[PDB]
Structures are given as structure tokens and as C-alpha cells.
Amino acid sequence: KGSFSNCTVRFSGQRDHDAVDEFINAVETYKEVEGISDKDALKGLPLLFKSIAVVWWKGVRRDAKTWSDALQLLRDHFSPTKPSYQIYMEIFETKQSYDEVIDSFICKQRALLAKLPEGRHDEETELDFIYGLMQPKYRESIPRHEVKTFRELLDRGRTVERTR
Amino acid sequence: KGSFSNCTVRFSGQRDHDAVDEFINAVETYKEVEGISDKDALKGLPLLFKSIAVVWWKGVRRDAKTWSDALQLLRDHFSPTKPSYQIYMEIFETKQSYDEVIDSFICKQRALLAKLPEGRHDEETELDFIYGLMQPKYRESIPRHEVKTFRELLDRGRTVERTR
Amino acid sequence: KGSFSNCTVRFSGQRDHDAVDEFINAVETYKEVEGISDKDALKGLPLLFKSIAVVWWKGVRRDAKTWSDALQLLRDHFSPTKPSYQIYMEIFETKQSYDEVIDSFICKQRALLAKLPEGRHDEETELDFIYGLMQPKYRESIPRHEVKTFRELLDRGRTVERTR
Amino acid sequence: KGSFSNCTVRFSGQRDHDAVDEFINAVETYKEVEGISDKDALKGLPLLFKSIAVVWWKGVRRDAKTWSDALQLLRDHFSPTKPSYQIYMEIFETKQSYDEVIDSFICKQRALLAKLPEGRHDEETELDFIYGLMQPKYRESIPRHEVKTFRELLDRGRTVERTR
Amino acid sequence: KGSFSNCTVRFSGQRDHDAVDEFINAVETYKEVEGISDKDALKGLPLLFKSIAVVWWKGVRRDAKTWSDALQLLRDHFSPTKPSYQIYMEIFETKQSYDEVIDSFICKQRALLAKLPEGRHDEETELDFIYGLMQPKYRESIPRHEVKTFRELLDRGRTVERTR
Q: For chain B: N or C, fewer Cβ within 10 A?
């Protein structure tokens, strides 16, 4: 049923991890849903670029041969894959300011913790790294060693938020 | 005939009841009209998120297994389901100001009264809760005990509005 | 061939006669062109609302049963169907200002004269009601009793406009 | 394959020759490409108007019977078909200012010369009417009687432009 | 499956090399992917122009007979194909300013070097022409004669960028 005719999601070259990962996941998901072969998918790839990136594709066209190589090359030229110590310094710089919802803080911190190499941290030390930066509006009620998984922190945060 | 190819309605994370309920009802209605199966509908769900929420979906992907569970989880993480006393204080705070149409006031107050638990109020006390906040431009003509249902209030409000 | 999948024309609740009549005529025309049945058309109606009006449709869903009833209810809740004397006062308030084209004035005045009940006025008194408000730039050349229909007024107005 | 479902090009009523001619040519071209019959094309015409013009179509609906009559009526009510002496005064009013490209000047002047009645001018006097208003940056090099057609003027203008 | 029905990419007449080359490559790629014949593709070409360029197409319609001739004519009337010495003066005018990423500089300089006639320069002198304008933030670490191809320059530039 077609092969990359037209869609809303495009890519520009904004040089950030979130936009690049969102675009790659959306394209990779669309290919699986619509059911397009691997050889037919690479011919339609300049139908998505609209910016500086199409000038980037006019030069590096002869380096790609398969779909996985082109996707890894798009991940390599733009996502700079920052090292570990900048991430560990970026988590401890900004505390949770007053009058901010729990869910935005938790999803931003989880998206920041996903950048580390996989298999290096469990769930328990993951929650222990995040339990040291919350406001005293939430730390007065729920103590440590009672919340065992990463869902129960939000489950008890939404109760104190409604109570005020 | 396809399975969530592309559409105008998307979701961002605006943290409000009206936008979330509108998006969920529009998606739930589109699934019923187009005739898509339940197993095929969950594979196409990241084609709708475009914001902070796609970073939220990159983390909580392994918690969803059926369509109803994913819809209830999207209702739970964003719509905060406010308690009763804040609603009963929010209805009595703002009176109807001068030079405002009847229909906007009635639809906003009905959308505010839908947040209570279902089966707790009849139609008569529902109209009795709304008849105490209207302007004297409308309360001089129509008295109580004459309007029995919730349609006749608008039916007699549109007559006095045309008369001026 | 589908049933209200996606389209550009939507409705918000702007509270005016022109936008409501345009939206209703466009939807009614699209249903006739595409060839959709009456029972299939009502299931897809919340795919068009995008505003306050979808909160209005979450409350008055159980009042509609057929397509004509829903269309008349949408005409009733928003188009206020103003009385006659306000129209007859609105026609005689604004004269035709200098340096304005004939066609805009004629189409606006015809759209204002359509609001009266049908069958109350002929063509001759219709032109007699409009011939008293034009500029002396056009009334110096063409006199009364020479223009018999409503097309010849524009036909002789476009000649004097080109001449200047 | 459908009959005027939805498209980007619409019409508003901007009262100019270029926008009206572009819209009419695009619609006339789309009808020929998609292959739609003449009786099916007139039912879908209010799906394109979005402005004051739809109020204009609610009044003059009963005057159209064929496609050519409706197209000529749309050309008549909006394009005012200016007389000859205003065109001959409009060509000689604005000279070519300094630092402006040749191609924009030539295409604008050709679009202005198309408004005259057809068959009144050859190619030679057409170029003779345009050779009297160019800058001395171009008239120092190429003389008259050497450029015979209307293409060689641009062909020798692009050479002097690159040279500077 | 259709023949140029509607798409996002259009052309205006912006008079620059990048936008024209992007539009031509996107159209040429779409024709190859969708599988449209050469005779059917030329009838649908005024469905893409939306600007001054459609007035340009109303005049030069009778000069095109095949697809390749129309594409070369669109490349000729707008892309001015600048001479060599302006390019060789444009490369050496702007050095790499401080705090700018390597990839943007490399892709812009490659897109500028593509304008020369093909077959005039190898890869080695191509890298030698670009190695004289970089910042001392990168020239302190990597010396000449160690980087042999044009990929290893970026491969060693991304390492020093992460290190800081």
C-alpha cells in the first residue's frame, strides 16, 4: 500500500538526541506497520528530508547500501553519543524546583538515564539515584525502603499531589 | 483500509482534562468507524505522539499489553482525576458575568459537572445547582418550578436573548 | 469510499451565521458527492469538532437519532435566527462608502436579505430596497425603471467601473 | 478515482488577475489529469470555496448549468478585464530599476502583455515594446537588430549577468 | 497509483541553488518511486507551482515537449550556474568561526565544492583545499598526511569534540 508517499514527520538537523530518536523510531515503526520491503524503503528516503539534511544526503549517497547501515549512519552523523561523566554531571546539576509536576520530572530523568550503556544499573540503584533530588513537599511523607519499584513512587506521588 | 496512517489529531501533554478527553474520544471513535482490530491498533500508537509524550512512550512501552490497558494508562498518567471538594468549590467561585451568551455558560458548567462520580445526582438537583448563579437579566422573567428539564432552560433563555 | 476520514473544514463555535451555514452546506454537499448512507454518517460526526464544540457534543449525544435531527440541532444551538426588525434596521444603517467595489456590496447585501422568511418579497421590491443606498458615483448614470432584473444592475455597474 | 475530494488550492476573492487565472488553470488542469466527467464536476464545486466567495455561491447557484458557463461566470464576476489604454499606460510607467534580475522583469512584462486581445501584435513589435525600458547595464553591450526572437534576449542577458 | 495528485514539496522562484536542486531531486525521485510514465508526467506539472513561477509557466508552455527538456529548462531559467572564479573566491572568504560544529562546516563546504565541473579534482586535493581553513581547536591534535580519505577527518573530529 504505497512506499513512503507523504507524511507529517520530517527531519531537519536540529542536533539533539530527542528529536533524532523520535524521528528514527517513528520511521522504523511506520515501516513495520505498513509492511514495506527493505530494498523498496531506501529508494524513498529523500522524500523525508527538507532542510540542510538534503544537502547532506546529496553527498553521502554512495556510502549507504542497506537500510540498517543508513539508519546507523543517520544516528552517527547527528546524535553525538555523549560520554558518561557529562551525563553523571548533568543529573546532579538541576534539582526539582517548586511548583512542578512529578510526571514531567520523572519522564525527563528517565530519558536522561537511558543514555548510559545498557546493563550497567539495576532498578534499585536507579531509584536511589533519583531519590536524592526531590522537593521537601514530597520527602516529608514517603520515606525510603517502602517504595520498591519505580511505579510506586509515582503512585504515591499522585496521592500527595491531589491532597495538597 | 489502513491502520492509523496519518491524521490531524495528535497529543502533546498539555495536562488538562478537556484536551485529553477529546483526544481519547476521537481516537476511540476513529477505531470504531474504520474497523481496526485490537491487536493491530497497538502497533500504530507511536504514530500519534509528537512531543514530550513520545519520550514518555519510550519508557513505559513494556507496561502495556492490551488496548484498554494502554488507554486507561494514558488516562491515568495525565488526567489527574481531581477530588470532589475542589469541584464543588470551583462551581461556586465564578458567577455569570454580564454580556455572555447562555449556551457557553451551560456547556461549560455541564462539562464541569461531568467530573463527579456517576449516579450521585439526579436531573432536578442538577438544575437546582445551576439556577443560583445566573444574571438578573434572565432571572427576572423565568421563575423556578416552571422549567422541569434541562432543555427548557435553554429554550426559554434563547427567547429572552432575542427579545433584549 | 470511506466515511468522513479527514478533511480541512472543521467547526469551532464562532457564533456567526456565515461560518455555520458554510460548514453545514459543505458537509451536506460532501455527503451527497461521496455517497454515504445516513446511518453511517452519524457515527463519524465527532471527527470534525476540534474546540469547545466537542465538549458540547459530549453532553448532547443522547438527543440525536437521525442525521436531519442532528443537523437541525446544530443549526438551533448556534445560529440564533435573529428577528425581522433587527435585519430591517441593519440594512439601512451602513451606506456604501466611497472606493468600494460593487460586487462585494451586492453579495453582502444579498446574504443579508436571505435571512428573512422565504416568500415574503419579490425581485422588484428586493431591488427597490437596495437602490436607495448606493453612491452618487453610480446613481448619476443609470436611472430607475431601466434595470428590471438583479443581474443588469451588476452588468451596468461593471461598465461604469471600467470607465472611471 | 474520486471527484474533488480535498486539495490545497482554494479561492478566496482577492480581486486580482494572477490569482484568479492561476486557480482556474490549476482546476481545469486537475480535471483533465484525473479524468472527471462534466456532470460530476459541478456537484463538487462548493468544496473549494472557503471565504466571502461561498456566500457568493449561495446566491448565484441557480444561474449555472454547465461547467463552461460556471467557469466563465467565475471569470466574469472577479477578473474585471481591464481596457487597453490602462495596460498601455501601465507598461510605460515603471522602468527597470537597478539591481534586479532579468528573468523576473521579462516574466512580469510578458504576463502584462498577455492581457491585450489576441492577434493584435507580432513577436517583433512585442520585443520592440520591451526594448525601450531596460537599464544601461544591459543596453551597452547588446544592440538592436541582432536579437530576432524573444529567447535570445534572455540568452544574452544571462551572459552579461554572469560576467558583471 | 495516481499521477502527481498532491504533495507538500512545491516551488516558488526563490533564486538559489539549494532549493532548486532539492525540488528537482525530490520530484525526479518521486517519479521513479511511484512509477509514472514520461508522457503522463508532463500533464501534471502545473499542479506544483504556486507563485510567480506559474505565471512563468503560462508563457513558456509551448517550448517544452519532453520531460528532460522541461527539467533542463527549469534548471536553466533559475539556477544561474555561476562561473569558477567566484566559487574559488567564495571558498577562501569565510573561515571557520569558533563554537561551530564540524559536520555543518563539512557538509556546507562539500555542497559548495560540488558546483565545479566534474572530473577536475581528486579526493586528495579536495581535502587539501579544506584543510587550510579550520580552527586551531582541531589543528593542534590531528596533523596532515595521517588522514587519507574524507571520512577519517570527521571520524577524528568527532573524537576531539566529545573530549573538549
A: C
